[PDB]
From Swiss-Prot:
Effect recorded for R54D: Decreases affinity for UBE2R2 in CRL2(FEM1C)-UBE2R2 complex
ADP-ribosylglycine found at: G76
Impact after mutating H68G: Loss of DTX3L-mediated polyubiquitination of histone H3 and H4
Known outcome of mutating S65E: Phosphomimetic mutant that binds and activates PRKN
Compartments in which it is found: Cytoplasm; Nucleus; Mitochondrion outer membrane
Full protein segment contained here: 1 to 76 of 685
Name by which UniProt lists this protein: Ubiquitin
């Protein structure tokens, strides 16, 4: 399924994911496409910070949803 990741630069990127994927795996996909190290990535959905060990499904993230990406420490 496709999801959107809205960054703070005004760029939105698209990802192909499964609801069984971990949040950790999603951050790896973002590093693959944009080059951002996972430990700099804070992902937010429905007002919740997403935990690396949980899955998209745990958060009820459905197709065509948008996550918000905020960068910490170095990227923020």
């Amino acid at each position: 399924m496709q999801i959107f990741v809205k960054t703070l630069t005004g760029k939105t990127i698209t990802l192909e994911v499964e609801p069984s994927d971990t949040i950790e795996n999603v951050k790896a996909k973002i590093q693959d496409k944009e080059g951002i190290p996972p430990d700099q990535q804070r992902l937010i959905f429905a007002g919740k910070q997403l935990e690396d060990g949980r899955t998209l499904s745990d958060y009820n993230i459905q197709k065509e949803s948008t996550l918000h990406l905020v960068l910490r420490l170095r990227g923020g």
